[PDB]
């Protein structure tokens, strides 16, 4: 599956914002499609396309709004892989002390990932690559100082990404896990 | 956790092969510890150490022989993550057509991974980095041409690796999945 528009085609940005002022910053001058120059990504990877092979317009048509939300349509069941009988592939897993986990988001949320898993494995939409700082303000890395249990399981493919990394849903939010002496942030 | 031996220390290769003829090729001239110059790996990654922070000798003492096998001690239950109640975190998952998977090994085996998942996530021992060719003779990449089900789940940490990628145990071997029109290899 690939976009029929060529590399020399002017119609590649069909059905997008088509904002001349931003077109050097965001793909098609459309912030939802992410930046023209990708920052960090945590050879064969060429098999994967930022839009899963669709064209920008077709990408937005498949994944954005669709319901009335005015934002992305997220996968079912917090994005865990769903087995052939309709149940998430996930169970309570105890994180050993010294484990590195990270979160793309502020300490309010309850989701973590194995540290430095690749962006493409998290099945995040492309608007989240919109970053100028080396490392985003909300990106955090932690070590497990004190064992605790999470709902752990594979990440379903979504938003044209292959997914199939692993994610941890915590039972307290990250701020609380820091406060109670489970997660210790680290700096550079 | 880090190795007390320094970067200027001559004792770093304590308890290893200590083979002067190979020491430029393998760490400590010991093929089990992998190469001195790593080929492909599919910034923050610095958090991870090829030996999980142990010293070469201590690594071999923890992970190698231990039983009489004369080889690495592998994780229980084919290396799937094991939940707090002792059951693997894994279920039957149907691979959609167009999915890229790969295998580090010949078509005889029954294990696959999401294509281009990072080495450190597979929890493979370091002897498997012993490679001169750009891509090893047995490394294969495939696309799913026809849907089928696998036992899918997270990979447990092991051999000093963080693991926590995802692996697929197939029910027929890879050669059979090729023959019956499920997997299509691709070339470069
Ligand atoms: C292209 O994007 C730019 C940048 O956001 C938009 O420029 C703004 O347009 C609004 C219109 O109400 C003005 O009030 C702002 O002052 C503008 N800001 C800048 C930085 O230029 C622009 O509207 C977009 N183009 C189109 C056609 O919508
Ligand atoms: C260091 O490794 C080399 C390379 O494998 C070993 O060299 C071989 O040694 C055997 C000893 O029986 C000879 O028969 C081979 O001809 C050697 N091959 C080469 C390419 O040199 C060597 O034995 C190792 N060193 C030690 C101390 O065991
Ligand atoms: C989404 O769909 C609704 C209803 O069709 C529409 O009013 C809205 O403008 C669309 N776009 C956004 C960004 O909400
Ligand atoms: C997992 O842990 C939570 C919170 O401690 C508990 O309520 C739940 O029953 C446990 N079991 C499973 C299978 O999630
Ligand atoms: C492993 O252990 C056995 C029994 O202790 C010993 O005979 C053998 O030499 C050891 N090493 C290897 C590589 O088998
Ligand atoms: C998975 O698939 C296999 C082979 O088709 C089947 O025997 C097994 O019962 C299925 N269910 C689970 C939970 O593995």
Per DSSP, what are the bridge partners of residue B161? B158
User: Cβ distance A124 to A104 under 8 Å?
Assistant: yes
Strand order in the sheet with A139-144: A91-95, A148-154, A166-169, A111-114, A100-104, A139-144, A183-185
User: Cβ distance A154 to A161 under 8 Å?
Assistant: no
Q: How far apart are CA B93 and CA A48, in angstroms?
A: 21
Q: How far apart are CA B147 and CA B129, in angstroms?
A: 32
Q: How far is CA B137 from the centre of its chain?
A: 16
- For chain B, give the number of residues: 188
The region, left, alpha or beta by phi > 0 then psi within -120 to 50, assigned to residue A4 is: alpha
Q: Cα of A65 to ligand 3 centre, how many Å?
A: 6
Q: Is B64 exposed, middle or buried (0-12, 13-18, 19+ CB in 10 A)?
A: middle
Three-state DSSP at A72 gives strand
Q: How far apart are CA B27 and CA A184, in angstroms?
A: 32
User: Cβ distance A112 to A103 under 8 Å?
Assistant: yes
**DSSP run (H or E) holding A103:** strand A100-104
CB contact under 8 A, A141 and B47: yes
Show the beta-strand stretches assigned E in B39-160.
91-95, 100-104, 111-114, 139-144, 148-154
Compute φ and ψ for A58, nearest 5 degrees: -70, -30
Q: How far apart are CA B101 and CA B105, in angstroms?
A: 13
User: Cβ distance A27 to A42 under 8 Å?
Assistant: no
CB contact under 8 A, A157 and B40: no
**DSSP run (H or E) holding B22:** none
**DSSP one-letter string for A29-46:** G-GGG-BSS------GGG
Show the beta-strand stretches assigned E in B33-106.
91-95, 100-104
Q: How far apart are CA A89 and CA A165, in angstroms?
A: 12
The long-range contacts involving A3-6, CB below 8 angstroms and separated by at least 24 positions, are A3/A49, A3/A51, A3/A53, A3/A54, A3/A55, A3/A58, A4/A55, A5/A55
Residue A21: how many CB atoms within 10 A of its CB? 8
Rounded to 10 degrees, what is the CA torsion of A47, A50, A51, A55? -90
**Count of A–B CB contacts within 8 Å?**
120
Which distant-in-sequence residues (6+ apart) come within 8 Å of B12 by Cβ? B3, B5, B28, B55, B56
Compute φ and ψ for B34, nearest 5 degrees: 85, 180
Q: How far is CA B158 from the centre of its chain?
A: 9
Nearest to B91 by CA among A77, A89, A164: A89
Task: Check pocket membership of B149 for ligand 6, CB cut-off 6 A.
Answer: yes
**DSSP run (H or E) holding B147:** none
Three-state DSSP at B30 gives coil
Q: How far apart are CA B108 and CA B147, in angstroms?
A: 20
Q: b/e map of A122-134 (b: 16 or more CB within 10 Å)?
A: bbbbbbbbebeee
Declared resolution, Å: 2.3
Residues of A recognised as catalytic: 103, 167
Q: What share of chain B is helix, strand, coil (3-state, %, to 5)?
A: 20, 25, 60
Domain spans, chain B? 27-185
Residue B175: how many CB atoms within 10 A of its CB? 13
B89 vs A contacts (CB less than 8 Å): 89-91, 93, 152-153
Three-state DSSP at A186 gives coil
Q: How far apart are CA B165 and CA A60, in angstroms?
A: 29
According to DSSP, residue A97 is labeled T
CA distances for B44 relative to A18, A135, A141, B26, angstroms: 35, 10, 9, 25
Three-state DSSP at A149 gives strand
């Amino acid at each position: 599956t690939t976009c029929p528009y060529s590399r020399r085609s002017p119609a590649y940005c069909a059905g997008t914002a088509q904002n001349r002022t931003l077109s050097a910053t965001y793909i098609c001058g459309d912030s939802r499609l992410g930046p023209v120059v990708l920052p960090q990504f945590f050879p064969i990877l060429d098999i994967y396309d930022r839009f899963g092979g669709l064209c920008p317009g077709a990408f937005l048509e498949k994944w954005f709004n669709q319901t009335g939300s005015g934002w992305w349509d997220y996968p079912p069941q917090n994005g865990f892989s769903v087995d052939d009988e309709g149940n998430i592939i996930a169970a309570n897993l105890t994180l050993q002390t010294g484990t590195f986990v990270d979160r793309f988001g502020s300490e309010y949320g309850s989701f973590l990932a194995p540290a430095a898993a690749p962006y493409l494995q998290r099945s995040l939409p492309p608007s989240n690559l919109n970053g100028d700082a080396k490392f985003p303000w909300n990106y955090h890395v932690y070590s497990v100082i004190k064992p605790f249990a999470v709902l752990a399981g594979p990440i379903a493919p979504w938003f044209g990404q292959p997914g199939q990394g692993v994610q941890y849903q915590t039972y307290e939010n990250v701020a609380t896990l820091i406060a109670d002496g489970y997660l210790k942030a680290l700096d550079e």
